[PDB]
Ligand binder design. Structure first.
Ligand code: CHL
Ligand code: CHL
Ligand code: CHL
Ligand code: CHL
Ligand code: CLA
Ligand code: CLA
Ligand code: CLA
Ligand code: CLA
Ligand SMILES: CC1=C[C@H](O)CC(C)(C)[C@H]1/C=C/C(C)=C/C=C/C(C)=C/C=C/C=C(C)/C=C/C=C(C)/C=C/C1=C(C)C[C@H](O)CC1(C)C
Ligand SMILES: CC1=C[C@H](O)CC(C)(C)[C@H]1/C=C/C(C)=C/C=C/C(C)=C/C=C/C=C(C)/C=C/C=C(C)/C=C/C1=C(C)C[C@H](O)CC1(C)C
Ligand SMILES: CCCCCCCCCCCCC/C=C/[C@H](O)[C@H](N)CO
Lengths: 82, 40, 214, 220, 207, 226
């Protein structure tokens, strides 16, 4: 199990951790004044207050699936003309 | 200092820092625990 | 209100209401009201299970180390009982899963729809008892001696005693596992060895807690 | 200090705006504008009121143990007073690993309360710790006055004496910090430890300088 | 200008006003701040005390008779050894019988802590019944010598004080036996021989 | 008001009400009024204990000149075991100290016989219990004599201890040694620290003095800074 198997989950946990923390920050700067100027000059303070929040990302991600908040409504996403 | 810290927060500077820490961590890990092929 | 840390900023969704609300949600996990409700039930279940388990690992041990019983170590009783009873692991576990699954199913649906198990006609004669009072508090068949019916402040005391004792028991179980994982001995053994030379027998001087190579 | 016309660092050069002169030992000395931010000033002031205080205790030790070792009294010099065997205890014998862990554990508790009050003033004074309230309050940043931290009542007494005392602390602390670099740099050049270096310099003052020590001046 | 203080010169705890018998204002850990709990805790002092008065008179007495020699081989058995001493039935049977007996008296008494004045009545004999009494003080048949008229107040402040002393006494007997490993009278005699060197400190230092 | 240094100015906190006030607070210790009140109790208690001690040390040298006051405990046969004597001493002192302190905490609370309420000490000032069967002269005059005598005694004790560490004898023996060679027994004549040299007086006190089989650590006060 130590080969590939166990290592698989290890990456998945950190991978989802990185992704979840990123979306947490993105969705906080969205709304805040000029959200485009907090992507170039990163708010290191708030970015450092969201890193540990991704430790229990699996618990929070599921709670969002079982609440319909992880994804967006299909009638609010712009789509290319068919 | 408010505006120097603003510069040290810009994407290029923050990425340079984050990566250096991550790289050094992996280097130091292999330095003390070398040849990590399997999780045993 | 007492807080997990003096000066710590209380979240917002943790308004003093749940038993043990010390304002500890650093990673804002219980932000969702529904999530908080399920987590509340999950906590109570975890604490109650741990309390009835650490009592089955410490109590039986303290009496074995006092000559009263002969119960084996918690990390060895499983095999001793298996060879003692003779029941195969597979069959023993499967039966347990089915029984636990049924009781969990009823509690699960009662959360999904509060006070639903008391459906007229469901459990032959007993459905009424299967009503429930508040989230993780199925008053009625449970709590028979009616200790949570005295006043509205004996409930709030007996409920802070369940949570603080549970949280402690839950951490105690984690400790016992880690203690044996590193020390390789029973919990009492670890405590006795520590009290012997308190300043020379800690997690630091175990060899596994901190693999000091440098 | 404690004045708009307080003596400055480079007579002539004007003092920084953030350095008004109120802060203890203010001489308008921030060439690289490190404390340009007001919040940075508060943190830097607290940090200085932390390094200097520890430095002062550390200097008192390197000087008392050294004075002892020179007079003859069995005292290991600051540099070799770590390999010295740890003393036993009624509870049991001391282990380096446990000693370090216990030292950090205790420090974490105190540091948390100190920083928490620094971030949230009066936060510790909530009777949470055994009812201690005002004693856990902070008279000023870096000044945790009370009946547990200022027992004699210098702060509670004459403010002029308190203010004067505040200047003494800052000046003495800055000196101790500089002195400490000495104790370390004189060791990492002479290899003898202070009070032996003071004794050598007072026996041949002209031929016992930093220049003649091998490490300081490489060519000489 | 109030009740005696456990430590003269100290203020009385707010919850401890003086209504309770023996209310010398002593609750440093604020254990009985809750009035509802103060009510339970009060009854528990009485029961724990009354039972310890009998326990102290159940250890000192047998040893006293044993010391005088008046006590039989039974008294010659130390209290911390009476358990092994044989009688007629094994230790288990005695405990089980006392349990069933206790269940009736205990539950009947509880009916009074829970609904005050709802147990005073002979179940077998409707005619027989105890008169009204404070929860904790049964009276009636429980006071055959009829001392419930002659200064109940100071006879009650006599009980709590004796009870508290008897409770500390049973603590001393166990603690002394826990360390000295001897009967209470033996420890007392060891003291009255060299009292300036048989103090707990000297004994524990020797240990 | 007489001042410790004629021509000096007494600190504001020392307006002068406490007996024996001489405007002496160079470091401004009793700046806090409550702190000064405590220090005042400390000064009187220290003086009274020191006054009894200094006198005892001198007497125990006129009567029994053999036993040295410093090592008297190890040179005297206690009628009772130290453990027993210490035990009784602890409870005895603990009781008086508690009642003594309670008065300072809440004045006029412990001013009564707890065993016999009939007995009750009359109203009194803190630091002055009320035991004044005989007062030879004005109370304040005697108060000043008590504090001046006490302050002198406290200084004398430190002198007794330090002299007992530099020399190895008591106060009377040391004074005689001075009276014999006055210009060659002074501290200057026995210890000199020059910018290059360090002559410190030998510590005549064994680092550890065994007592009844238990070696008791007896350190020479800051032997390193003499
Ligand atoms: C929270 C629940 C729970 C926990 C913490 C444990 C823990 C343990 N059980 Mg176990 N059990 C639990 C539930 C149950 N057990 C059993 C039936 C048994 C048996 C029959 C035995 C155990 C044994 C053990 C111990 C060794 C595990 C093992 O066989 O690994 C073997 C794997 C390794 C040694 C590899 C390393 C594993 C390590 C974690 C890494 C261990 C400390 C064994 C015992 O008694 O120990 C001597 C044993 O023989 N359990 C049942 C019945 C179905 C359970 C629940 O229904
Ligand atoms: C016909 C299909 C049918 C299915 C799939 C279920 C399924 C279930 N019924 Mg159920 N029932 C079904 C028919 C009927 N029930 C009832 C009357 C009840 C009652 C009274 C109760 C249930 C309950 C339950 C749940 C018990 C959980 C449990 O024991 O899991 C444990 C897991 C197992 C036993 C393992 C299963 C193994 C798997 C099938 C094979 C191996 C893989 C469960 C999900 C309970 C519940 O939760 O109600 C809310 C309950 O109390 N049923 C009646 C008569 C009215 C039925 C008539 O057809
Ligand atoms: C805070 C400043 C500090 C400074 C400037 C020093 C400086 C020194 N320590 Mg040291 N220590 C300090 C704190 C502490 N030390 C120790 C425990 C020790 C030990 C056990 C030893 C030293 C030793 C030494 C000396 C040799 C260093 C060496 O070989 O590495 C070893 C360094 C360490 C083990 C700790 C260094 C911490 C920085 C050196 C002059 C050695 C000595 O005595 O030299 C002869 C030695 O054996 N220190 C502790 C407790 C864990 C410290 C703080 O808590
Ligand atoms: C306040 C009540 C009470 C107290 C203070 C004691 C105290 C004691 N009992 Mg005991 N008992 C009490 C009630 C009862 N005992 C017994 C039956 C026994 C027996 C059979 C024995 C004792 C013994 C003892 C002594 C040794 C402790 C022991 O049993 O170790 C057991 C240790 C652990 C359980 C751990 C001890 C001083 C022992 C004794 O006296 O032998 C020297 C003994 O053998 N008791 C019964 C049943 C009738 C009781 C009540 O119903
Ligand atoms: C918060 C940052 C973030 C997150 C959560 C995601 C998430 C996702 N990306 Mg994406 N991406 C990102 C940044 C991010 N990306 C950036 C910066 C780039 C430009 C290089 C891309 C370019 C990219 C491409 C081309 C594709 C995706 C795709 C995907 C999806 C496939 C899952 C996967 O394996 O990841 C994939 C991630 C990558 C391939 C590269 C991104 C990896 C970086 C290192 C993570 C970002 C870290 C961020 C800087 C942290 C910010 C923290 C904040 C405090 C500053 C997934 C949902 C795939 C897709 O669309 O699926 C349908 C795909 O085709 N991404
Ligand atoms: C599985 C056990 C468990 C569960 C489900 C909960 C659930 C909850 N706790 Mg809790 N707690 C626990 C164990 C648990 N606790 C233990 C053992 C302690 C002792 C330290 C505490 C001490 C504690 C305090 C002081 C407080 C809470 C509070 C809360 C509530 C805040 C909301 C929240 O954070 O969501 C639930 C959290 C999760 C679902 C995360 C799951 C745990 C992660 C995944 C494990 C990570 C490691 C973990 C930190 C330690 C285990 C190793 C919540 C319902 C707050 C409260 O009472 O508000 C009403 C609060 O003040 N808890
Ligand atoms: C289990 C025995 C017991 C119990 C239940 C009580 C209960 C009570 N006592 Mg009490 N007391 C006891 C033993 C006990 N006492 C003994 C042995 C002494 C002699 C030292 C005293 C001396 C005493 C005084 C002088 C006073 C009280 C008072 C009180 C009441 C005040 C409320 C309170 O303190 O909370 C409840 C306290 C407890 C539940 C104690 C629990 C037992 C502890 C936790 C055991 C710990 C180990 C122990 C140190 C040995 C209360 C109902 C005050 C009062 O007003 O009287 C009515 C008061 O003035 N007690
Ligand atoms: C218990 C073992 C022990 C030993 C063998 C020593 C030995 C020594 N100490 Mg010392 N000390 C100790 C414990 C010990 N100390 C403890 C626990 C403390 C903390 C209170 C101190 C604090 C201390 C200070 C502040 C000083 C010494 C100094 C000295 C040296 C001066 C000579 C002397 O004996 O007078 C002792 C000197 C004193 C001021 C006496 C007060 C402290 C003594 C040693 C404690 C005795 C009582 C205590 C219960 C033990 C000497 C070699 C002096 C020194 O460093 O020389 C340069 C010095 O100034 N010690
Ligand atoms: C419902 C009902 C009904 C009616 O009402 C009546 C009644 C019957 C009464 C009820 C019942 C109830 C119950 C069941 C309860 C339970 C409880 C418990 C068991 C707790 C525990 C609890 C438990 C707990 C806390 C635990 C604890 C533990 C601990 C701390 C431990 C510690 C440790 C560690 C880690 C490790 C080492 O090496 C050792 C030590 C050091 C030792
Ligand atoms: C009030 C307060 C308040 C604050 O807040 C806090 C604090 C301070 C903590 C508190 C205090 C408390 C206390 C002290 C308590 C105590 C108790 C006791 C001791 C009891 C006894 C108790 C005791 C008791 C019952 C006793 C019992 C006994 C018995 C039955 C019997 C025994 C015996 C005898 C006869 C003899 C034989 O041969 C054997 C036997 C059979 C074995
Ligand atoms: C055996 C341990 C006893 C510990 C000493 C007494 C318990 C200390 C508990 C501290 C709780 C806060 C201290 C007192 C607070 C006040 O009385 C109010 N309850 C809180 O404002």
């Amino acid at each position: 199990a130590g080969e590939v198997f166990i290592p698989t989950f290890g990456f998945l946990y950190v991978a989802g951790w990185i992704g979840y923390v990123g979306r947490l920050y993105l969705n906080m700067v969205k709304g805040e004044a000029k959200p485009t100027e907090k992507e170039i000059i990163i708010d290191v303070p708030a970015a450092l207050r969201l890193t540990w929040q991704g430790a229990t990302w699996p618990v929070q991600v599921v709670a969002e699936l079982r609440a319909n908040t992880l994804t967006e409504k299909a009638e609010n996403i712009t789509i290319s003309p068919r | 200092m408010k505006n120097f810290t603003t510069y040290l927060s810009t994407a290029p500077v923050v990425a340079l820092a984050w990566f250096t820490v991550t790289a050094a961590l992996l280097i130091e890990i292999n330095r003390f625990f070398p040849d990590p092929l399997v999780f045993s | 209100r007492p807080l997990w840390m003096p000066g710590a900023t209380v979240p917002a969704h943790l308004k003093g209401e749940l038993a043990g609300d010390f304002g500890f949600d650093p990673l804002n996990l219980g932000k969702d009201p529904q999530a908080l409700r399920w987590y509340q039930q999950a906590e109570l279940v975890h604490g109650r299970t741990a309390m009835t388990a650490v009592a089955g690992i410490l109590i039986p041990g303290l009496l074995t180390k006092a000559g009263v019983l002969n119960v084996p170590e918690w990390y060895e009783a499983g095999k001793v009982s298996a060879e003692q009873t003779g029941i195969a692991l597979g069959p023993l576990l499967a039966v347990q899963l089915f029984m636990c699954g049924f009781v969990e199913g009823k509690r699960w649906m009662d959360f999904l729809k509060p006070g639903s198990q008391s459906e007229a006609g469901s459990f032959l004669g007993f459905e009424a008892s299967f009503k429930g009072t508040d989230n993780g508090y199925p008053g009625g068949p449970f709590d028979p001696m009616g200790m949570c019916n005295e006043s509205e402040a004996k409930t709030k005391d007996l409920k802070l005693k369940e949570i603080k004792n549970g949280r402690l028991a839950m951490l105690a179980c984690l400790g016992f596992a880690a203690q044996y994982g590193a020390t390789g001995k029973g919990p009492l053994d670890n405590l006795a060895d520590h009290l012997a030379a308190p300043l020379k027998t800690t997690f630091v001087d175990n060899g596994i807690s901190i693999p000091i190579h440098l | 200090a404690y004045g708009p016309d307080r003596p400055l660092w480079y007579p002539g050069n004007p003092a920084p705006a953030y350095l008004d002169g109120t802060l203890a030992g203010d001489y308008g000395f921030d060439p690289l504008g490190l404390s340009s931010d007001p919040e940075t000033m508060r943190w830097m002031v607290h940090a200085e009121l932390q390094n200097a205080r520890w430095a002062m205790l550390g200097a008192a030790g390197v000087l008392l143990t050294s004075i002892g070792a020179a007079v003859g009294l069995p005292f290991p010099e600051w540099y070799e007073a770590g390999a010295a065997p740890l003393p036993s205890t009624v509870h049991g014998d001391w282990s380096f690993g446990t000693l370090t862990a216990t030292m950090f554990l205790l420090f974490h508790w105190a540091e948390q309360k100190r920083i928490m009050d620094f971030r949230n003033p009066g936060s510790q004074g909530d009777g949470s710790f055994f009812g201690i309230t005002d004693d856990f309050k902070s008279k000023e940043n870096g000044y945790p006055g009370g009946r547990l931290f200022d027992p004699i009542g210098f702060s509670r007494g004459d403010e002029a004496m308190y203010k004067k005392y505040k200047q003494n602390e800052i000046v003495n602390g800055r000196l101790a910090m500089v002195a400490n670099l000495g104790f370390w740099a004189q060791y990492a050049a002479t290899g003898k430890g202070p009070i032996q270096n003071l004794a050598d310099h007072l026996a041949d003052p002209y031929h016992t300088t930093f220049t003649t020590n091998g490490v300081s001046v490489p060519f000489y | 200008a109030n009740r005696p203080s456990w430590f003269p010169g100290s203020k009385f705890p707010a919850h401890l006003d003086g209504t309770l018998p023996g209310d010398h204002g002593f609750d440093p850990l604020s254990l009985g701040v809750d009035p509802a709990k103060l009510k339970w805790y009060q009854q528990a002092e009485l029961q724990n005390g009354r039972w310890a008065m009998l326990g102290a008179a159940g250890i000192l007495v047998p040893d006293l008779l044993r010391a005088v020699g008046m006590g039989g081989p039974a008294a010659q058995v130390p209290w911390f050894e009476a358990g092994k001493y044989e009688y007629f039935a094994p230790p288990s049977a005695l405990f089980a019988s006392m349990m069933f007996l206790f269940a009736f008296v205990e539950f009947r008494r509880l009916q009074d802590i829970r609904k005050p004045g709802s147990a005073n009545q002979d179940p077998i004999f409707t005619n027989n019944k105890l008169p009204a009494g404070e929860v904790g003080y049964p009276g009636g048949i429980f006071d055959p010598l009829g001392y419930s008229k002659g200064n109940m107040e100071t006879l009650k402040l006599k009980e709590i004080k004796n009870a508290r002393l008897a409770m500390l006494g049973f603590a001393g007997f166990v603690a002394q036996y826990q360390t000295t490993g001897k009967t209470p009278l033996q420890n007392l005699s060891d003291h009255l021989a060299n009292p300036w060197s048989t103090t707990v400190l000297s004994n524990d230092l020797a240990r | 008001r007489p001042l410790w240094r004629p021509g000096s100015a007494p600190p504001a906190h020392l307006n002068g009400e406490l007996p024996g006030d001489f405007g002496f607070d160079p470091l401004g210790l009793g700046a806090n009024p409550e702190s000064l009140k405590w220090f005042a109790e400390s000064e009187r208690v220290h003086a009274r204990w020191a006054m009894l001690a200094v006198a005892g040390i001198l007497v125990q040298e006129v009567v029994k000149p053999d036993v040295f006051w410093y090592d008297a405990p190890t040179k005297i046969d206690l009628p009772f075991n130290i453990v027993g004597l210490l035990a009784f001493e602890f409870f005895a002192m603990h009781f008086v100290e508690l009642k003594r302190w309670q008065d300072f905490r809440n004045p006029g609370s412990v001013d009564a016989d707890p065993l016999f309420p009939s007995n009750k000490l009359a109203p009194h000032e803190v630091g002055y219990p009320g035991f004044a069967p005989f007062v030879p002269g004005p109370m304040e005059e005697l108060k000043v004599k008590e504090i001046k005598n006490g302050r002198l005694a406290m200084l004398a004790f430190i002198g007794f201890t330090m002299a007992a560490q530099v020399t190895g004898k008591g106060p009377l023996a040391a004074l005689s040694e001075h009276l014999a060679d006055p210009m060659g027994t002074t501290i200057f004549s026995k210890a000199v620290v020059v910018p290059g040299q360090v002559v410190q007086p030998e510590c005549k006190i064994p680092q550890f003095t065994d007592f009844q089989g238990t070696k008791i650590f007896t350190p020479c006060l800051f032997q390193g800074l003499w």
